[PDB]
Amino acid sequence: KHDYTNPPWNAKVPVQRAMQWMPISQKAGAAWGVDPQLITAIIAIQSGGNPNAVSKSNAIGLMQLKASTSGRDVYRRMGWSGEPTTSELKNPERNISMGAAYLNILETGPLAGIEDPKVLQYALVVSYANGAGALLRTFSSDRKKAISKINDLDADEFLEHVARNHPAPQAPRYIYKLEQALDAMLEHH
């Protein structure tokens, strides 16, 4: 019921720009067990493939990591102290390595137990940008119960649930933008 396809998003240039980094995304995806096409879609959607992108809240670089949030999570998972600096997050190789780690952190953490890889992919794009917590709580206040209910859905039912029930209108739009980006990636071989 969110009008999430409006306005139409043309993925062509954002993905063309995100694809410049694909040699890195291939290696980061291999290192973290993460799909390089999901990494590429998230670069296209979050930064437009601009390695110097900086958000209003100082999310930095191709995969829009915030030093005091996503960067801290990447440092904690790695057993490192403190948080990355702005300069480290601007480096395309390190930015993408950290975004891939954050995707692994979401997959192996809050979203652990999701069975269908396509449902997991939709869950990750919505969680990356809007929070794994907010998404899970649309299903249930018990995480374990939310994963159970998600595992009873196919990808189309998952999207339909997010479109009808997610408080954030951008949540279902991330899934739409992901599909536009996967379509545009079909033109790159």
Side-chain angles (χ1 to χ4, degrees):
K1 186 139 175 290
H2 287 304
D3 184 27
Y4 62 84
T5 63
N6 180 30
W9 181 67
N10 188 333
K12 200 247 221 131
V13 165
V15 166
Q16 181 179 326
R17 285 171 189 186
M19 280 303 297
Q20 182 153 30
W21 309 108
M22 178 57 89
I24 301 176
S25 311
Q26 291 274 3
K27 284 198 280 130
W32 280 100
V34 170
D35 179 11
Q37 296 203 115
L38 175 57
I39 287 165
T40 300
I42 285 171
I43 294 166
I45 295 166
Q46 293 291 86
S47 74
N50 184 357
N52 290 323
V54 170
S55 76
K56 304 165 180 78
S57 56
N58 261 332
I60 305 300
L62 289 170
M63 294 193 75
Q64 284 290 281
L65 289 136
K66 177 157 171 51
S68 62
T69 60
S70 30
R72 166 132 69 229
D73 278 32
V74 169
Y75 272 38
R76 269 199 225 105
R77 171 67 183 83
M78 287 315 294
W80 301 335
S81 74
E83 39 167 67
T85 68
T86 289
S87 294
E88 308 184 325
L89 286 177
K90 289 285 176 55
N91 177 273
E93 173 180 275
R94 298 310 177 104
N95 186 280
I96 290 172
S97 179
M98 290 189 75
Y102 191 62
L103 280 171
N104 174 293
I105 282 162
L106 292 174
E107 164 170 1
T108 61
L111 306 173
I114 293 175
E115 284 178 275
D116 186 299
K118 189 58 169 177
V119 171
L120 172 60
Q121 186 200 75
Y122 281 9
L124 280 165
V125 69
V126 170
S127 294
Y128 192 91
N130 274 101
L135 173 68
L136 292 166
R137 284 189 283 107
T138 70
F139 290 90
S140 174
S141 72
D142 183 50
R143 148 162 206 279
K144 204 210 166 48
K145 173 57 154 277
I147 278 36
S148 199
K149 294 157 93 164
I150 288 161
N151 282 326
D152 271 14
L153 302 189
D154 81 355
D156 290 333
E157 285 163 356
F158 186 86
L159 169 55
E160 187 178 75
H161 167 100
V162 169
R164 277 190 326 242
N165 300 326
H166 200 294
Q170 292 298 302
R173 192 158 174 78
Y174 279 105
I175 293 169
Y176 161 74
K177 286 195 191 197
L178 169 62
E179 283 300 342
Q180 293 292 96
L182 293 178
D183 289 351
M185 267 172 258
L186 287 175
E187 311 305 15
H188 298 259
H189 315 284

